[PDB]
Amino acid sequence: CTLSAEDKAAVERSKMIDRNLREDGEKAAREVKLLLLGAGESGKSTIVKQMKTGIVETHFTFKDLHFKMFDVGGQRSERKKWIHCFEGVTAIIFCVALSDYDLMNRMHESMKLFDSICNNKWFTDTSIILFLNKKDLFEEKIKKSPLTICYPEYAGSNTYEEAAAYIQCQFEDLNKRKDTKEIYTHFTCATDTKNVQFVFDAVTDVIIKNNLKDCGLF
Amino acid sequence: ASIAQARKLVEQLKMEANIDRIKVSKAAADLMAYCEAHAKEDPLLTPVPASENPFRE
Amino acid sequence: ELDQLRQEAEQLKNQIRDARKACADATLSQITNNIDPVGRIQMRTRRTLRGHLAKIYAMHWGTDSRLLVSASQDGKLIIWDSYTTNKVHAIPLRSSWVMTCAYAPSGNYVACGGLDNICSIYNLKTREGNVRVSRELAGHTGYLSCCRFLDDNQIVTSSGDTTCALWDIETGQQTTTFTGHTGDVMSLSLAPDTRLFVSGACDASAKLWDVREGMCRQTFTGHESDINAICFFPNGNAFATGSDDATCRLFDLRADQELMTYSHDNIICGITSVSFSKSGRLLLAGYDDFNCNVWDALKADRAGVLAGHDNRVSCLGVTDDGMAVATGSWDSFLKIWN
Amino acid sequence: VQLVESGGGLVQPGGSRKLSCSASGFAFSSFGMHWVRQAPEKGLEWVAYISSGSGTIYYADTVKGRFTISRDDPKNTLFLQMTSLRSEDTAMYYCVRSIYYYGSSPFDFWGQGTTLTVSSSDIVMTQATSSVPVTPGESVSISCRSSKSLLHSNGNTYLYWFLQRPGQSPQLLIYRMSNLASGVPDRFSGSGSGTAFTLTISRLEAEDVGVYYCMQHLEYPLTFGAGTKLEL
Amino acid sequence: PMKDYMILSGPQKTAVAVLCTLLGLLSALENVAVLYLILSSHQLRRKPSYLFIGSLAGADFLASVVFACSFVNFHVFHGVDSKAVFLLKIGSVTMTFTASVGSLLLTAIDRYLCLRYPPSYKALLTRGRALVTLGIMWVLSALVSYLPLMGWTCCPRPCSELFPLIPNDYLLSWLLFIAFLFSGIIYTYGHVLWKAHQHVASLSGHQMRLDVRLAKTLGLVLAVLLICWFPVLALMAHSLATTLSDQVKKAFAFCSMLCLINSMVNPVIYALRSGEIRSSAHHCLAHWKK
Ligand SMILES: CC(C)CN1C(=O)CN(Cc2ccc(-c3ccc(F)c(CNC4CCOCC4)n3)cc2)C1=O
């Protein structure tokens, strides 16, 4: 065999390490990664509390699905030099503060970040589970002040039903890859308890579509 | 406040402006001399047979 | 006065450029045309390494030129035997977002770091059979981009918080910090004598620091985009930088100006890794076009392609004896070329 | 790191026994364990070897089929089930810790041992020096010769040196040709010619008195050498 | 001497000789191109589903060539061959077609696993398991398809009339085997559609596209398969109970060539529908133009 006793034993140790690697990789592949790029103070921590250093890992399960949320907003550096690390993440959870449309404008900063990360060359096929946080604050605020301060081209009604829909359409008009990715939108607040469920269905739809694309059905 | 960084740049440029400099000809000659001196010891520039090559499968 | 000091700095920069121009009597391309071309370099994949399941982001050779450490995003740090493709150790990292890895010259310690803002040093040799973490270094406010070992007790680090740090492993403190960079520091290279070291940041500039003083001796502004990779010359008086504008440049430490530009029109993608071979004649650069080029450090003519990777060649390194070149790629495949 | 062992006793011949080696202080699963005998007046002799994950189990020709070695990784213990105990199995069974990778140090730690006293084609290594005296502070070169060359095609010479102080468990000194083990003073040095080997020690104190055993790990069975005693 | 068996040899066989050979050559070309694309991209090979698609393509390519040659030799050349080699062609063509049907079922099961276990699909059905199931179905088809000659000589029971010296009980057994295969295909596709409908209903429970798209694609892949394979099996089952006194043999030949039409329609329906195969074809065309 031209191999020594120690060489053969080292080969066996390498095979055992390979088996442990395969087991850990299968366990990791059973899990779901969810990058969480919020627009700063746009209700990022509220959703994290609702589902339960530099980068914070949040682990939670729901219907026997091990999720992993990565809060990377604390990096405070150039995003281009490490945003490729998250390439291949299952879905980006974007948090936008609806009440931040009066603060240039904070909602415009959120829109700029959404445009920057949605049209990035890494997340072309990575879908976005968009979150429009603080819908109660939006409903309260829309009566004292109008949306004209933030959106100058807006000319619709004033009620929350139309204004929130207009904001959602504006955020959903930013994806130039309307075919290879889909934006899942949900209007959440501090009292909602179904946000984790909505994340579950959005993630399972994303995984189903990815599998169908990989299996040739699409 | 920003004047601190402003003049710190000036002291840094003072320090990096008084260093001695050799010409490009001499530096290139030294680089070339080192490249030529150790050419025989380079297993990549100078290929070696399979006898002493540890990567032969 | 603020503007008066800014004008003084501008005049100083013009004077520095004038000194460099006065030193620029000739150029390397005009002085190394009579030398014989290196000839076409044909390297074959001797060992391809299987066992990583995600994107490999860093690698470092051991001093003995037989062992190496590979870092990937799956959260594991496999120590490889290059001569026979075995796994000596598999290190489960606390954070799976690793971006750098370094093998100590002694070999007893390996270090990894990434987005977790922590440089984790792992004790390879211990009377337990484990690779338990020896020390976790904290103090960086940005992502850690490069790790390099001075000795078993000191490790230098490049981070994204516009600074570099020289740590003391036994006490886990900040001995000296190197400030002066405007953008994120992406890679550092250590001189063979370990007296000085360079660092390529994202401000299209590479600096040269005195490790024992913390001061910046020299600043090299030659590129137009971010500098991703850097590597010292084997002699110790030159260093090549791999930028994002698909160009590599050879700077020198005694004329403080660029010596040579490694550019080609057919290449429009940035450089992830750069490292000279032994004798410094060949410049092995990994690109984002699933490719690794081999350049002649004295002639602009390219030596040869090193294709064979299905994704971006994230990192590459040459052995201490120069016998082999190992390249890591984002396709979860280490490849060693001779 | 310790390996305490249980077993032994006055077994009538032909009975059965189950020696146990409970390991505490290290990653037991990653270490390929070993068993070594020692007759009251004879040298070491290899018994069995169970690797990591129990993938490969080896036995000596004198105990093959009769003995049975196994490990309980979760319980951190090592078992050696014995049957039909002859009167020639009376020995001091040792539990040897061994790991196997590049640059590793096999046979690192040895256990206390059990006094099991049952009532009533391999590479042979010869140690010519049965017993040599020494003046404390001089240099001696223990030389033992092998049968076939231990120099493999990979450039590794598989020769191990073990020191056994009086009334103590063996301790690893040099785990290959000129590779000092951890915790061993630098005075211990070894070098061989591929078939004949020597172990040279510069300065001697009361720590060096004992018996030095040279062993080969090129192939199984793991043949040891005879006793080489150093007397003050 | 067997002229009494080949039903038609006269004014009508002029068209079929060109027709079946043209369909066979086109199907073979398409399938060869498909399998070359699968095996050349060096990335679809690692993905377990496209290896199943390529296995279907190869089985159907063998089907096209074997059926084309056998039919032009039988219903045009009227070639009478030795039973050892004459029933070998029966066994081989049966093996190819049963392998094609089994590959259809295996892709159907892969697509079912894409929905029943979304998150675990990638790691549950891996590369090695993919070839394991591939070889299992291939050898099962080979055995159940070459048993007609090596196993049964139809000496105790009368041999088939619509099929040359083939045991009638083997006819019934293989027809039941293919009926089970098609029932499995329909069952897994129906479960796929039901899972998609339930999932879209659950997703739209707070805020139809997926189930409609799946309905369209699976409806094509199922309707074409039915109108290409059900007629010939139905004609066979009719022949189980009749004596073919009424003219059904040239009609059976027509059904056979329309079943061969499934051979050319399989690539476009399954592999060309996939975006990855289309992109790989475009890249290969660009490389060839280079
Ligand atoms: C040399 C010979 C090959 C040429 N040859 C003849 O000798 C007779 N013939 C007419 C024919 C037509 C279609 C099919 C067929 C079509 C589809 C199909 F799936 C099968 C499966 N096979 C089974 C069918 C049940 O029973 C046993 C054989 N079979 C089989 C035969 C013919 O092509």
Q: Identity (one letter) of the amino acid at C161?
A: D
Report C:120-149 residues touching D (Cβ under 8 A): 127-130
Per-residue tokens: D65: 């089929």
Task: Note the resolution in Å, 1 decimal.
Answer: 3.0
From the list D27, D101, D108, the residue facing C130 with the nearest CB is D27
Per-residue tokens: E114: 């894409």
Whole-Å CA distances, E209 to A4, A87, A176, A180: 62, 27, 20, 14
φ, ψ (nearest 5 deg) of residue A194: -95, 5
Residue with tokens 């976790």: C136
Contact status, residue B19 vs residue C215, Cβ threshold 8 Å: no
CATH top class, domain A3-218: alpha beta
Q: Write the burial class of residue E174 (CB in 10 Å: 0-12 exposed, 13-18 middle, 19+ buried).
A: buried
Where does chain E break, by residue before each gap (C–N > 2.5 Å)?
207
Is some CB atom of chain B closer than 8 A to the CB atom of C44? no
Contact A208 E210 (CB under 8 A): yes
Q: What is the dihedral sign for C-alpha A136, A141, A147, A150? A: negative
Q: Rounded distance, CA D186 to CA D179, Å? A: 11
Q: Rounded distance, CA C240 to CA C248, Å? A: 7
From the list E49, E119, E203, the residue facing A214 with the nearest CB is E49
Is some CB atom of chain A closer than 8 A to the CB atom of D57? no
Phi-psi map region of C180: left, alpha, beta (phi>0 left; psi -120 to 50 alpha): left
Kindly report the nearest CA distance between residue D122 and chain A, in angstroms.
14
Q: Identity (one letter) of the amino acid at E111?
A: R
Q: Rounded distance, CA B45 to CA D77, Å? A: 55
Per-residue tokens: D14: 């032909």
Q: Rounded distance, CA E211 to CA E197, Å? A: 5
Whole-Å CA distances, D75 to A20, C29, C167, D24, D52: 20, 69, 40, 10, 14
Residues near ligand 1 with C-beta < 6 Å?
E 70-71, 74, 86, 89-90, 93-94, 97, 148, 163-164, 166, 171, 174, 232, 256, 259
Per-domain residue ranges of chain D? 2-118, 126-230
Task: Decide: helix, strand or coil at residue C307.
Answer: coil
Whether the link from the prior residue into E119 is cis, omega within 30° of 0, is: no
Contact status, residue C202 vs residue C184, Cβ threshold 8 Å: yes
Q: Rounded distance, CA C315 to CA C284, Å? A: 10
Task: Decide: helix, strand or coil at residue C43.
Answer: coil
Contact status, residue D117 vs residue D183, Cβ threshold 8 Å: no
From the list C97, C115, C202, the residue facing A78 with the nearest CB is C202
Task: Decide: helix, strand or coil at residue D148.
Answer: coil
What number of other Cβ atoms are within 10 A of residue E140's Cβ?
Answer: 14
Find the closest chain C residue to D181 by CA distance.
C127
Is residue A216 a known part of a binding site?
Answer: no
Residue with tokens 């000036």: B10
Q: Rounded distance, CA D94 to CA D109, Å? A: 10
Contact A212 E123 (CB under 8 A): no
Atom of ligand 1 nearest to the CA of E178: 19
Residue with tokens 């049964």: E152
Per-residue tokens: D103: 């640059």
Per-residue tokens: C194: 């370990």
Q: Could you tell me how many helices (H) and strands (E) chain D has, helices first? A: 0, 18
Contact status, residue D99 vs residue C127, Cβ threshold 8 Å: no
For chain D, the straight-line distance linking the first and the last C-alpha, in angstroms and rounded, comes to: 31
From the list A5, A10, A16, the residue facing D218 with the nearest CB is A5
Contact status, residue C271 vs residue C246, Cβ threshold 8 Å: yes
Atom of ligand 1 nearest to the CA of E71: 33
Is residue A196 a known part of a binding site?
Answer: no
Residue with tokens 């050419």: B39
Kindly report the nearest CA distance between residue E223 and chain A, in angstroms.
16
Find the closest chain C residue to B21 by CA distance.
C255
Among residues E103, E187, E180, E91, which one has the least CA distance to residue E138?
E103
Among residues E178, E182, E159, which one has the least CA distance to residue E169?
E159
How are the residues of chain C apportioned to helix, strand and coil, as percentages rounded to the nearest 5? Answer: 10, 45, 45
Angle, helix E249-266 to helix E209-241, in steps of 10 degrees: 150
Task: Estimate to the nearest angstrom the gap between the alpha carbon of C100 and the chain centroid.
Answer: 10
Is residue A8 a known part of a binding site?
Answer: no
What size, in residues, is chain A? 218
When divided into structural domains, chain B yields a total of 1
The string of DSSP letters for C190-237 reads E-TTSSEEEEEESSS-EEEEETTT--EEEEE---SS-EEEEEE-SSSS
Size of interface A-D (CB pairs under 8 A): 42
Contact status, residue E133 vs residue E139, Cβ threshold 8 Å: no
Q: Rounded distance, CA E102 to CA E152, Å? A: 23
CATH 3.50.50.60, domain D126-230, yes or no: no
φ, ψ (nearest 5 deg) of residue C140: -80, 130
Kindly report the nearest CA distance between residue A200 and chain C, in angstroms.
23
Strands D131-133 and D229-231: parallel
- Look up residue B44 and give its DSSP letter: T
Q: Rounded distance, CA A60 to CA A94, Å? A: 18
Return the H-helix or E-strand segment holding C271: strand C271-276
Q: Write the burial class of residue C2 (CB in 10 Å: 0-12 exposed, 13-18 middle, 19+ buried).
A: exposed
Per CB-CB distance under 8 Å, the chain D contacts of C88 are 101-103
For the CA atoms of E25, E30, E35, E36, the dihedral, rounded to the nearest 10 degrees, stands at 90
Report C:170-189 residues touching B (Cβ under 8 A): 180
Q: Rounded distance, CA D146 to CA D194, Å? A: 8
Across the strands, what pairs with D83? D16
Q: Write the burial class of residue D98 (CB in 10 Å: 0-12 exposed, 13-18 middle, 19+ buried).
A: buried
Per-residue tokens: A53: 């250093």
Sequence-ordered strand ranges (E) for chain D? 2-6, 16-24, 33-38, 44-50, 57-59, 67-72, 77-83, 91-96, 114-116, 126-127, 131-133, 140-145, 159-164, 171-174, 188-192, 196-201, 210-216, 229-231
Atom of ligand 1 nearest to the CA of E236: 25
φ, ψ (nearest 5 deg) of residue C172: 60, 45
Per-residue tokens: E92: 């081989």
Contact C128 D1 (CB under 8 A): yes
Mark out the alpha helices in chain C (DSSP H runs). 2-23, 28-31
Q: Rounded distance, CA C207 to CA C198, Å? A: 5
Q: Rounded distance, CA D78 to CA D5, Å? A: 9
For the CA atoms of A76, A82, A86, A92, the dihedral, rounded to the nearest 10 degrees, stands at 40
Q: Which of C52, C89, C97 would best serve as a mutation to test chain A binding (most A beta carbons within 10 A)?
A: C97
E92 CA to middle of ligand 1, Å?
Answer: 10
**Residue having the nearest C-alpha atom to atom 4 of ligand 1:** E70
Across the strands, what pairs with D92? D115
Find the closest chain E residue to A202 by CA distance.
E203
**Residue having the nearest C-alpha atom to atom 16 of ligand 1:** E256
- Look up residue A149 and give its DSSP letter: G
E21 CA to middle of ligand 1, Å?
Answer: 16
Q: Rounded distance, CA A103 to CA A109, Å? A: 10
Q: Write the burial class of residue E237 (CB in 10 Å: 0-12 exposed, 13-18 middle, 19+ buried).
A: middle
Return the H-helix or E-strand segment holding B9: helix B2-17
Residue with tokens 């994204």: C160
What number of other Cβ atoms are within 10 A of residue A36's Cβ?
Answer: 22
Q: Rounded distance, CA C12 to CA C2, Å? A: 15
Domain that holds residue B37: 3-55
Per CB-CB distance under 8 Å, the chain C contacts of A20 are 90
Task: Estimate to the nearest angstrom the gap between the alpha carbon of A168 and the chain centroid.
Answer: 16
Angle, helix E127-150 to helix E48-71, in steps of 10 degrees: 20
Contact C128 D25 (CB under 8 A): yes
Contact status, residue D168 vs residue D110, Cβ threshold 8 Å: no
Per-residue tokens: B14: 């003072």
Per-residue tokens: A129: 């589970």
Find the closest chain A residue to E218 by CA distance.
A217
Q: Rounded distance, CA D166 to CA D169, Å? A: 9
Q: Give domain C2-337's CATH superfamily.
A: YVTN repeat-like/Quinoprotein amine dehydrogenase (2.130.10.10)
From the list B21, B30, B41, the residue facing C237 with the nearest CB is B30
Q: Rounded distance, CA C52 to CA D109, Å? A: 33
Contact status, residue C291 vs residue C313, Cβ threshold 8 Å: yes
The string of DSSP letters for A52-119 reads ---SEEEEEESSS-EEEEEE-TT--S-GGGTGGGGTT-SEEEEEEEGGGGG---HHHHHHHHHHHHHS
When divided into structural domains, chain E yields a total of 1
Q: Identity (one letter) of the amino acid at E66?
A: V
Q: Identity (one letter) of the amino acid at E141?
A: S
The CATH code of the domain at D2-118 is 2.60.40.10
Q: Which of C66, C128, C130, C131 would best serve as a mutation to test chain D binding (most D beta carbons within 10 A)?
A: C128
Contact A85 C90 (CB under 8 A): no
Task: Estimate to the nearest angstrom the gap between the alpha carbon of A115 and the chain centroid.
Answer: 14
E94 CA to middle of ligand 1, Å?
Answer: 7
Kindly report the nearest CA distance between residue C115 and chain A, in angstroms.
6
Return the H-helix or E-strand segment holding A18: helix A5-29
Per-residue tokens: D121: 């084609």
Whole-Å CA distances, E154 to C2, E141, E149, E177: 107, 21, 9, 19
Contact status, residue C70 vs residue C312, Cβ threshold 8 Å: no
Q: Rounded distance, CA E145 to CA E87, Å? A: 11
Q: Rounded distance, CA E224 to CA E269, Å? A: 9
Kindly report the nearest CA distance between residue C262 and chain D, in angstroms.
39
Is some CB atom of chain A closer than 8 A to the CB atom of D55? yes
From the list C84, C92, C202, the residue facing A81 with the nearest CB is C202
The string of DSSP letters for chain E reads -GGGTS---SSSHHHHHHHHHHHHHHHHHHHHHHHHHHHHSSSTTTSHHHHHHHHHHHHHHHHHHHHHHHHIIIIIT-----HHHHHHHHHHHHHHHHHHHHHHHHHHHHHHHHHHSTTTHHHHS-HHHHHHHHHHHHHHHHHHHHHHHHT---SSSPBPSSSTT-BHHHHHHHHHHHHHHHHHHHHHHHHHHHHHHHHHHHHTTT--HHHHHHHHHHHHHHHHHHHHHHHHHHHHHHHHHS---SS-HHHHHHHHHHHHHHHHHHIIIIITTSHHHHHHHHHHHHHHH-
- Look up residue A181 and give its DSSP letter: -
Contact C141 A76 (CB under 8 A): yes
Per-domain residue ranges of chain C? 2-337
Task: Estimate to the nearest angstrom the gap between the alpha carbon of C149 and the chain centroid.
Answer: 12
Among residues C91, C128, C104, C113, which one has the least CA distance to residue C165?
C113
Contact C322 B53 (CB under 8 A): no
Contact status, residue E143 vs residue E176, Cβ threshold 8 Å: no
Task: Decide: helix, strand or coil at residue C26.
Answer: coil
Contact status, residue D173 vs residue D188, Cβ threshold 8 Å: yes
φ, ψ (nearest 5 deg) of residue D151: -80, 110
Angle, helix E275-289 to helix E13-40, in steps of 10 degrees: 90
Q: Identity (one letter) of the amino acid at A217?
A: L
Per-domain residue ranges of chain A? 3-218
Task: Decide: helix, strand or coil at residue C136.
Answer: strand
Tell me which of E3, E80, E90 to substitute to probe ligand 1's pocket, judged by most ligand atoms within 8 Å of the beta carbon: E90
